[PDB]
Amino acid sequence: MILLDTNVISEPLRPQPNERVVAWLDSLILEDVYLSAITVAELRLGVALLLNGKKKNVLHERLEQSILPLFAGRILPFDEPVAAIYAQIRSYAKTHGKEIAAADGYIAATAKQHSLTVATRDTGSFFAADVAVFNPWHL
C-alpha cells in the first residue's frame, strides 16, 4: 500500500513533469493509494498561495472536485495513535544522530501506523524513521 508524499502528487502538475514519475503513478491501483491529511493541507495551502488568480481558481476547483475525490475514504488523519509513533520515530532518530523534521515525521508516522510505503523524492528522513520508502524518480 502507498502513502503519497506532497512532492510526488505535485510532480504531474508541473509544466514539464518527470515522465518516469507520471508513469509510476499510472501503474498503481488507486484503492491502494493513500494521502495523509497533512499532505492534503499542504496541497491546499500551495494552491491558495498562487500569485495568478485565474490559475488559483481553476486549480482549486480541480483539486477539490477532481483530485481529492480519487482519495475519498483514504485521507488519513494524524490522530492519537499516530502521535505515539511520531514521538517514537523522532526521538529515536535524534538519539541516534539522524535527522527528521516535524513535517516529514508526521507523514512517516502515518505510514508506519498503517503499514504503508512512503512515495517521495526525499527519502532521507524516512530512512531514519525506519519506514519503507520508494522514490519514483528511480526504477
Binding site: 504531474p12 502538475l13 508541473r14 494552491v47 481553476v58 477532481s66
Partner: peptide
C-alpha cells in the same frame, strides 16, 4: 485508473504549477 495521467492533464490545462 491512471492517476498520473489524470494529474498531468490538470497541470497542462492550467499551464503548470509548483506545489
Amino acid at each position: 485508473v491512471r492517476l498520473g495521467s489524470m494529474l498531468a492533464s490538470i497541470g497542462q490545462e492550467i499551464g503548470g504549477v509548483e506545489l
